[PDB]
Amino acid sequence: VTARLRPELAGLPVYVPGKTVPGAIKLASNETVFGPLPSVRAAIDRATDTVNRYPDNGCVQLKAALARHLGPDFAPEHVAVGCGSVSLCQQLVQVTASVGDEVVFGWRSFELYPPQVRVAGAIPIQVPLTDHTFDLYAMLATVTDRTRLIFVCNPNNPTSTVVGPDALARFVEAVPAHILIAIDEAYVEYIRDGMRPDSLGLVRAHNNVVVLRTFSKAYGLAGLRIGYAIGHPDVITALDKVYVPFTVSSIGQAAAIASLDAADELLARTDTVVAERARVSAELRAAGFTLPPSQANFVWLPLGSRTQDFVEQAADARIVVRPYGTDGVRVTVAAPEENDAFLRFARRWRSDQ
Amino acid sequence: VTARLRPELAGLPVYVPGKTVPGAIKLASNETVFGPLPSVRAAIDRATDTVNRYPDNGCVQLKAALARHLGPDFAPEHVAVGCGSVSLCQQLVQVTASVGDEVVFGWRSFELYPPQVRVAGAIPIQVPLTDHTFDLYAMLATVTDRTRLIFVCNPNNPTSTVVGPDALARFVEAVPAHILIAIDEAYVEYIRDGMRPDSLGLVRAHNNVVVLRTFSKAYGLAGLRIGYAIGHPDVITALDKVYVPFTVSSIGQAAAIASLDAADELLARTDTVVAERARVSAELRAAGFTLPPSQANFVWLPLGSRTQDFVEQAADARIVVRPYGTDGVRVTVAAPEENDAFLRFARRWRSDQ
Ligand SMILES: Cc1ncc(COP(=O)(O)O)c(CN[C@@H](Cc2ccccc2)C(=O)O)c1O
Ligand SMILES: *Cc1c(COP(=O)(O)O)cnc(C)c1O
Ligand SMILES: N[C@@H](Cc1ccccc1)C(=O)O
């Protein structure tokens, strides 16, 4: 006899990290490459003084700062904070979907959507992509009476691509207005080529749109775990009901506030990443690789059954990239010397095939 | 029209941030009063250098340190880590209970038990205490075909009491073996008078027992959010399947490992708390208050309908204590001069009744 656990746990699609290759160049986690600004370390140092005290559960000053950052139409009541946007992903399922309810998203997409939906006893509706891109028409066709939540990942992880900004608006307009739609905008700060949607305009115009963002990437605080959701006050209130209390640390909040104060400098750095992304993409395509147009801080290599081998051999060259089954490899765009090292590996590996 | 959210959210509380008055004495969150040791600050400071990188999702070094700390009977496979033990409480519900299922606990007890159970669509079976203590017999009598999880909070929050250590073993031996039992031991470090149960021994002897502990109180890291569970490897594996990835921060892991290195010093400090707890209890009893025997870092005042008034008047005197409905007030034992300020207020308040 053992402790009886839920049958849903059986072969639950777990998030598995990449194995650590000591000293390897880290192109597997979509991290930016710079340590904290002086003002961010100072805020962290000051917050370290009171590590014996619980954080502000309501993240009051952080919400105020976020609403200010967001603009005049946004107040603290429109903002929920979570322990990474990954926590907010689960909170969205928890406020919308239970047993038998359906959650729709393009697939392949963020690897945590399926397990988080399954943990709730809900049914993941995984809609195939075309041109490695969310197919909004196919997703809409997939809606039923049991649909309680839709995830639009934009840019998409792991395929790197974006939908058209007006297409997104038409999609939102077409979805029954009582179904919550979450636009996961983890890489929104890297979009260029006039493809960035009117994210805030959409939440202003639609009560059922919620936008998710993160401090982990462009704002460089992946280690400290701060994400936020922007939406209608009733949606925000619900997210905070299921929020596990105190999960956003005091150091996290302090660092996040200091980072918003330095947004202009931090956002400006994304230009350099975009330039390197364009260069890495061009050189890969020149060497014979196929990949879609990226609007994030990584590219997607649909290598199929060669995925495992690519990633194993990269690891032999002290380079860590992220495999996805037998679909493809996601490679983060990092510092120029690091990207060149990846490129030398890629060209050699290609020639050998 | 608004987004349709789960109706079960009506069973969950909204918290609303109360006043944050400068100079108020903080006796409402069960916190210890000392800031970080030099070695803990150093761990935090060094992990800050790489805040742009994600944490170790598997908390490998922290689990190894916990397994050491636990001794030769326990390996990393017996340990799950969570973003505070509050996160692990939810994870326990997620591996055991869904719609229709029953979760048993004493009541009044940890304020998070009911909402976390409601979130899963499960039903909380709230069993009345006897003399402000868990009634283990009454709890056993409430067990049914639908019972998937039992919480025993020991010491109990908010009533401060423990069950007999031998009685706890008898109860565990008597519970049907397929039912997971969680022993919440957030205040275990404060138990004295021969009342500490053989917590680890219960884990070793029963596949269905899990123990929850925290770095928030005795180890003084409430701000950083690290809890842990000790259990059978298959239960631990399950907890880690529903674990929200990267929620335990890099700074949190670094700080916890360093605190474990300083366990002797940190644990030695609990003796002073216990001395204050006894003094506070005696002084309250001389003033005419009746309270049960505490084994935590707080005392419980069963003031019934007078609790709201007590707490409000304390707040006017710049003292923060925690109300629990019309049941009672939980008062943290902290620095002697804070405790004296509280006692002066309590004495005045009582003589005014
Ligand atoms: C599309 C998308 N949404 C959310 C998140 C989570 O970011 P957070 O704000 O929680 O740091 C990501 C991030 N993806 C990375 C890292 C990761 C984090 C949690 C779980 C799995 C992976 C990745 O490697 O996929 C994202 O892309
Ligand atoms: C304080 C407390 C905890 C610990 O919470 P953390 O999330 O570890 O800070 C757990 N359980 C109970 C009943 C408590 O009172
Ligand atoms: N989350 C509640 C209750 C709580 C207190 C302490 C720990 C966990 C939960 C609060 O704001 O205080």
Author numbering:
A (entry chain A), B (entry chain C): 1 to 353
Published text:
In order to decipher the structural basis of their substrate specificities and to provide a rational, we structurally and biochemically characterized two 1β aminotransferases from Mycobacterium tuberculosis (Mtb), an HspAT, encoded by rv1600 (mHspAT) and a putative phenylalanine aminotransferase, encoded by rv3772. However, experimental characterisation of this aminotransferase in the current study clearly demonstrates high catalytic preference for Phe, Tyr and Trp instead for Hsp. Therefore, we propose its reannotation of as an aromatic amino acid aminotransferase (mArAT). Contrastingly in mArAT, residues Val86, Phe110, Leu112 and Phe246* form a hydrophobic substrate binding pocket which provides an energetically favourable environment for the specific binding of hydrophobic substrates such as Phe, Trp and the less polar Tyr.
We also report the experimentally determined structure of mArAT-aromatic amino acid complex. The binding of Phe and succinate in the active site of mArAT as observed in the crystal structures of mArAT-PLP-Phe and mArAT-PMP-succinate complexes revealed the molecular basis of substrate selectivity of mArAT. The two liganded structures are virtually identical (an rmsd of 0.28 Å over 305 Cα atom pairs). In the substrate bound mArAT complex, Phe is present in the active site of both the monomers of a homodimer, though it exists as a PLP-Phe external aldimine intermediate complex in one of the monomers, and as free-Phe in the other monomer. The carboxylate group of free-form of Phe is held in place through interactions with Asn157 and the PLP bound-form makes an additional interaction with Arg330. The N-terminal lid regulates the entry and binding of Phe by rearranging the side chains of Tyr15, along with Glu111, Leu112 and Arg322. A stretch of residues of the lid exhibit plasticity (Leu9 to Ala24, rmsd 2.9 Å over 16 aligned Cα pairs), by adopting different conformations in free- and Phe bound form. Tyr15 forms a H-bond with Arg322 when Phe is covalently linked to the cofactor in one monomer. In the other monomer, the carboxylate group of ‘free’ Phe form H-bond with Arg322. The present structures clearly demonstrate the role of the “arginine switch” mechanism in the binding of the carboxylate group of Phe in which Arg322 moves away from the active site to allow the access of the bulky head group of Phe.
